[PDB]
């Protein structure tokens, strides 16, 4: 059978919060079967735990935030994307502050942490959510969709008209039958436009931002000295974001996500909308891995 997975060992890293600019200690720890991913604010007294579930998401305008009462964990999506991509079902995530460190702006550093810790198979069937009916949400011209698909696929389109994006592909369709999350998605960095970053900084936000952890673009150019890591890095980062935001479902997906100019807010709305309609999905397990449309 396809088994649940956790970490073999505890592993640590340090970094700064993109939004807060605050140095933070990050710890990833093994967890028992059926735990899911649970964040813990170990700086607080008492320590506060927040399960990484769609219903615990708070504000989403900037990054995906988990909340419990007055306690938050900001910017969970890049770490969760790595968890999702490597098939980690169960883990504790300990933080010394209210924001996951931004690291290099991608999921690469978290893939390295997970691969370094090692993967541990557990004696329980891994549960998948299979999309049975297409479900969609929209806001203005933005749209996010789950579509039935025998496998796991993420498609995305962005539609920037600024000169810097002219001629760029702005679309990608990743079928993970034949695409490596690690090699072809995980290192795509977050990005921002100068005018937007200036606005944030003017308000004493984005205090951890630097050209070392974000792609900076203006109307016409990519400003980073060495340009892009992937030819289509922008849309690949939107896919990275979607994979992490989607993992708040708490299980891997059998289906296709399609995003059109969408972000964290529609991603979470899509999850809550899916969860609420039991005719649109079912939980499946695979007693024979060979019969599965996916592979970890
Ligand atoms: C792409 C998204 C989905 N919109 C989203 N990214 C952000 O919202 C975002 C917000 C701020 C920054 C930034 C910076 C910077 C700087 C800087 C300031 C001063 C100096 N002297 C040098 C550099 C990057 C990304 C995201 O990935 N969510 O997961
Ligand atoms: Zn423009
Ligand atoms: Zn992102």
Author numbering: 1 to 296
What do the study authors state?
In this study, we used solution NMR to investigate the conformational states of small-molecule inhibitors bound to LpxC, an essential metalloamidase that catalyses the deacetylation of UDP-(3-O-acyl)-N-acetylglucosamine during the biosynthesis of lipid A in Gram-negative bacteria. We chose Aquifex aeolicus LpxC (AaLpxC) in the lipid A biosynthetic pathway for structural and dynamics investigation due to its exceptional thermostability, which has enabled both NMR measurements and crystallographic studies (for example, refs 13, 14, 15, 16). Pseudomonas aeruginosa LpxC (PaLpxC) was exploited when co-crystal structures of the desired AaLpxC-inhibitor complexes could not be obtained. We show that these enzyme-bound inhibitors dynamically access alternative, minor conformations in solution in addition to the ligand state observed in the crystal structure.
Taken together, these solution measurement-derived rotamers collectively portray an inhibitor envelope that can accommodate three substitutions at the Cβ position of the threonyl head group. To test this prediction, we merged the two conformations of the threonyl head group and generated Cβ-di-methyl substituted compounds with the third Cβ-substitution containing either a hydroxyl group (LPC-037) or an amino group (LPC-040). Structural analysis of LPC-040 in complex with PaLpxC indeed revealed the anticipated ligand conformation with the two Cβ-substituted methyl groups forming hydrophobic interactions with F180 (F191PaLpxC) and the stem of K227 (K238PaLpxC) and the amino group directed towards solvent accessible space to form a water-mediated hydrogen bond with the backbone carbonyl of F180 (F191PaLpxC). Excitingly, the Cβ-triply substituted compounds LPC-037 and LPC-040 both showed enhanced LpxC inhibition, displaying Ki* values of 14±1 pM and 12±1 pM, respectively.
